[PDB]
Every structure is written in C-alpha cells, then in structure tokens.
DNA sequence: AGACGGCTGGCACGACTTTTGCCAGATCAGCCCTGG
DNA sequence: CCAGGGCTGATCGTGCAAAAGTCGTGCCAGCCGTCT
C-alpha cells in the first residue's frame, strides 16, 4: 500500500444503472456472509465489548 | 440505544433474531441425540413460528 | 443537505473555499433500504 | 517410638462428579452462570416508541480530521495529516514515535523535516498542544502562544525548557540553585506553569455511562437492615408441563428412558441452583450481621474477619464459603462492593483489641490528606500518631499501605506554601 | 566539602489464610416371577 | 388365587486436605538533608 491511493479508493462509486431483483439462492446468501452467529448473547456487561 | 445505560435493551429487531437464534440452536442439539419424533416435531414448528 | 455523507463534507469544504459546485454522489437511506431488502430471501442489486 | 504403618479413622467423606459439578456450578458469577445454565437449557429440552437512531457524536479524531478538511494541504501532507491524526490519542498526545510514522508511510521520499511541518501545521488546531510528542512539547506551546505581556513568562519558559525532572521531584532547592532564579517570586511562575491544561484532548467528549448491576441488596427497616436477594438477577428454572406429561404415555422404551433421564437431570440441576441461591443469601445475611458497625460508621470503623469467623456462623465450610464470595457485588446505600473485599488482615492494637488493615489504609489515607502542605508527614511521624491512637503498626506496613493507596512519598509531595 | 542521621524500598523469613482438586457406593422400595 | 423371594432402579449425599498464596515485620542498601 502507499497510503495515497487506499484513501481515494474508499470515495468511489460505480455507474449503477437499471437496478434488478431477483429470488436468492443459498450459495448467493452464503457468499453475501461473512461470517455464521451461534448465539444469542449481544454484549457482554463485564467488558462491554463485542 | 440504551435507556438507563446499564443495560442496552435493545428491542424490535434483536429480540427476534434472539428468539430464532436460541430455537435454532436447540433445535439443532436435539436433532443429534436420537430425540422423540414428537419432541422434534414440535421445536420444528416453534422454529417455523419463529 | 441529507445522507450523502460523502458529499456533505465536500460541499462545505468548496463553499468555504468559494466553489459552490456540487458531489452528488449516492444517499445513505438508500443503501439501508437495499441491505434490509438482503436481509429477507430476495436478492437485489444494481447494474452497470 | 517407630517408623510403622497405622491407621486409625476419625473423619467421613464422599463425592460423585455431578457433585462436583454442582459445587464447582456456585463458585462463579450470575452474568456468566446464565451462559452455562442457557448451554444446558439447550440440551435438555424438557427444561425452561422505543428510542432508536441516536445522534452522531463528535469526537477529537473526527473533529480534527474536520479542521483538517478546510486547510489547504497538497495531497501528500493530507495522506500525513491522515496518519499523524489516526494516530492520536483521547488524552491528545500522539502513541507513536515519528519515525514509526514515517514507517507507516513507508516513501523514500517522505522525510522527517516534511512529517515534522505537518505535524507542527496541525499542532496550531482548536485544542492547543493536541498532537504532542510528550509532556515537554505541549505545555511548550501554550506558553508560546500566550502575549508576552504577561509577567514571570521567560521564567515559566526556562523551567519547562529542560528543568522537568527538577520540578517533577518537587526538589525546589536544586531548581533554584540550577536556574539562579528569585527566591519565592518563582511561585507565580511556578502557578503559571501549573494553570496550563494538561492533556487538553480530554475536554472533547467526557461522557461516562453509569454500569452498576447488583446481586445482593440491603435495606435499613429503622435498624437491623434485612438482606433480599436481586429479584431481577437470580436465575429460574421451571419444568417442562408439556414433556413432563408425555414420558409415561409413550409407548417406545427409547421414549421413555429419554425423557426419564433428562427429567432425572433437569430436577437435580433444579436443586442445585436453588440451593445455591440459598447458600448465598445466607452468607450474605451472615456477614452483614457481622459488618453491621461498617455501614453505620464508615470504612476506619471496621472489625477485621477472617473466613473462619464467618464460616463457624454458619455450618458451611471455609472453602464453601470461600467459593460462594467470588464476583459478588452487594449493593448498599453507601454504595456498591464486593462479598469478597470485607475479608481482609488483622493487626492487633494496645489493649487486647484488633484493627481491620483496610480501616486502618482508610485512617491513613485522611490522615496524610489533612496535613500541612508546608511539613509533610513521614511514615515514622505516621507510625507515630498511629501508635498515639493505640493501633501501634509498624513502619513497614505504613509504608505498604501508602503506596498501594498510589499516594507518593512525603519527601514527593512537599510543595510550596 | 565530608560525615552523620534519616528516609524509603527491595528482599527475606516465619505465621497464617485460601484455593482448588478430589470422582460412589450401599441401601431401600415396588414390581414381576413363582411356590403354596 | 394369595403370599414369598428376587431384582432392578431410585435415592441419598455441598466437606477434607494439600499447596499456593498472602500477611506482617525485620534487615540492608542507596540517596538526600544538614552541621561542621
């Protein structure tokens, strides 16, 4: 990185023309994840961190 | 959002993914025991439900 | 004037330096509204 | 009178692991038991407007990137300005070295005199001496920004120049003798030099949450205050109705020793956790009986105690009880505690009697505090009223209890009147 | 300017606290099989 | 058809002690204040 490119890179926006929708798939919503949640605790009160 | 600020209280979006999260999990820790048809059954409809 | 926030910093930046032009770029409610449509079984996107 | 193998029984004992499991279940707090007690809840399965879309702070980072915006930097001063800022702390001095910046940058052509012309071009915004190196660079330019008009400033100027160290040890003789300066007219500049805001980055944004939960609370009903439990806090169980009634109705052998053996498991957990409710309310009734003087009168007012003391009130054992007061906080109305914090080291005083060492910390600590500023008091003078009220500790443990109390040495603190 | 007294802290030594790591078995009651 | 024997599972049980840890108090070294 040479840290004059990674900032202008995060302001930029593409031509998004004729917006689509359509049903999804599983491996269509497996690639919009990151990552899986397995539980239901939300924020911990000892730290209060993630 | 929190109210008192000891505790958040968050409500109206996470107490529902709370709700399928915990149903899911159990439903999904019973399905390996060799649980009764009856049992599974009817966590899969509360999971539905939910 | 709203939730392109992007835009808004650069707007009061050329009107302190006596610019008056305009970013427009792309508001922030709209992309809410697409993620919470990706958050139901519906896949939505947008095209080039 | 030998060596031989004997034998001879005066004692009982007996143990099975879910008894461990369920003595070991009561040496933990409540916030992190309902992780565990939701864990077996998931095994077991016969066992059981608003305010949204709050405002935008601004915060020192965001309003100095802000600042930096609207001044009139080339490209590559903005991509410094950007890291030298990201790299800033709450208190407003930067938490790494500027050749650790000049890494991060990582060009052969950024060198440290431009790094050190960004820097000093954003050391002039809104919070004056925000982006400093240390201490020495941001008192520094306060002194420097304020009019000549006002008096004893070259002086302010001389001490904080390389005297830090000189003034830090509150050493006032070898600073005169090293500065060749006024005798007490150094004062007001000293005062100057004092009324200069340090860690200016601070006053940005001071909010703090109040983060207070209770597990145990007292009351005073007009004397001998009664203890209850957390209603809210403690953790239930409750039977399943539903697969309660449906073990003895299915027919398949497999069905019914299931629901036999996780009707078995889920009644025993049940026990467990009430009887672990009620072996906490019990200490705690107990040692606030034992601690009723504290809350009356005050911390210096406190009976010293030891587990056994407690444990012989009750039939509990010391290691029971010593499990159950961990990750406990009581909460009464002089504030919020620890089961565990009462506990704490004897030192006997003339007459037969004993001192609690937190008492005797708290009797120290505004003892040192209302003294003379001109005359500190030393730990011997210390040990000496100390042995005027009776308590008689030694030097030493005064010592130990000034500095774990964070209070610098007497000699440290001696300032000018 | 140097020696004497004093102050403070690190390290050590009993004396006492507190923290964890143990891992079943026998005994009794109801039901089923069998003898009278 | 009624009484005796077997057998299986249901039920009971939050303390002992060993080792790590903490406590108070002394001993000694190094820096500083002050008079000669």
Redesign the interface.
């Known amino acids: 990185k040479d840290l004059l490119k990674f900032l202008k890179a995060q302001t930029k926006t593409e031509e998004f023309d004729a917006i689509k929708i359509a049903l999804a798939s599983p491996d269509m919503i497996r690639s919009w994840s990151f990552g899986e949640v397995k539980k239901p605790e939300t924020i911990n009160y000892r730290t209060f961190k993630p | 959002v929190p109210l008192d600020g000891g505790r958040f209280a968050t409500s109206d979006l996470n107490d529902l993914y709370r709700r399928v999260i915990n149903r899911n999990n159990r439903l999904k820790r019973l399905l390996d025991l060799a649980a009764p048809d009856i049992i599974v059954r009817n966590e899969k409809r509360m999971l539905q439900e939910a | 004037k709203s939730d392109d926030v992007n835009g808004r910093t650069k707007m009061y930046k050329n009107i302190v330096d006596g610019n008056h032009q305009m970013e427009p770029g792309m508001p922030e409610s709209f992309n809410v509204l697409l993620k919470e449509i990706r958050s139901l079984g519906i896949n939505i996107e947008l095209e080039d | 009178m030998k060596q031989g193998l004997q034998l001879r029984l005066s004692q009982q004992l007996a143990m099975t692991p879910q008894l461990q499991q369920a003595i070991r279940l009561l040496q933990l707090s409540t916030?992190?038991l309902q992780?565990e007690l939701?864990q077996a809840?998931?095994?077991n399965?016969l066992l059981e407007l608003?305010?949204?879309?709050?405002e935008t702070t601004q915060t020192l980072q965001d309003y100095l990137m802000?600042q930096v915006?609207?001044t009139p930097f080339t490209?590559?001063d903005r991509?410094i300005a950007?890291?030298i800022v990201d790299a800033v702390d709450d208190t407003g001095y930067l938490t790494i070295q500027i050749e650790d910046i000049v890494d991060?940058?990582?060009?052969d052509e950024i060198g440290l005199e431009e790094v050190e012309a960004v820097l000093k071009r954003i050391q002039r915004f809104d919070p004056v001496g925000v982006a400093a190196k240390d201490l020495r660079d941001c008192l520094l330019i306060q002194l420097s920004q304020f009019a000549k008009e006002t008096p004893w400033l070259e002086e302010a100027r001389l001490i904080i120049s390389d005297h830090l160290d000189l003034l830090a040890n509150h050493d006032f003789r070898t600073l005169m003798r090293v500065t060749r300066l006024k005798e007490e007219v150094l004062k007001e500049a000293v005062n100057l030099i004092q009324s200069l805001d340090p860690r200016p980055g601070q006053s940005i944004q001071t909010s703090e949450?109040?983060?207070?939960?209770p597990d145990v609370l007292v009351r005073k009903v007009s004397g001998r205050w009664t203890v209850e439990l957390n209603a809210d806090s403690i953790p239930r169980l409750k039977i399943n109705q539903?697969?309660a009634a449906?073990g003895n109705s299915?027919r398949?052998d497999?069905?019914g020793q299931?629901?036999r053996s996780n009707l078995q498991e889920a009644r025993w957990l049940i026990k467990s956790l009430e009887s672990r409710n009620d072996t906490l309310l019990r200490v705690s009734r107990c040692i606030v009986e034992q601690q009723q003087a504290f809350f009356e009168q005050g911390e210096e007012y406190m009976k010293p105690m030891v587990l056994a003391d407690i444990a012989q009130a009750v039939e509990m054992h010391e290691s029971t009880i010593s499990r159950v007061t961990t990750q406990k906080y009581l909460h009464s109305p002089r504030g919020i505690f620890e089961l565990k914090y009462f506990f704490s080291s004897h030192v006997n005083t003339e007459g037969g009697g004993e001192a609690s060492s937190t008492a005797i910390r708290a009797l120290v600590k505004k003892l040192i505090a209302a003294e003379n500023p001109a005359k500190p008091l030393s730990d011997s003078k210390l040990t000496s009223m100390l042995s005027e009220q009776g308590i008689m500790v030694a030097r030493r443990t005064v010592a130990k209890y000034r500095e774990s109390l964070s209070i610098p040495p007497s000699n440290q603190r001696k300032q000018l009147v």
């Open positions: 916030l992190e992780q939701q809840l998931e095994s399965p608003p305010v949204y879309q709050g802000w915006e609207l490209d590559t991509a950007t890291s991060s940058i990582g060009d949450p109040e983060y207070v939960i539903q697969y449906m299915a398949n497999a069905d299931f629901i």
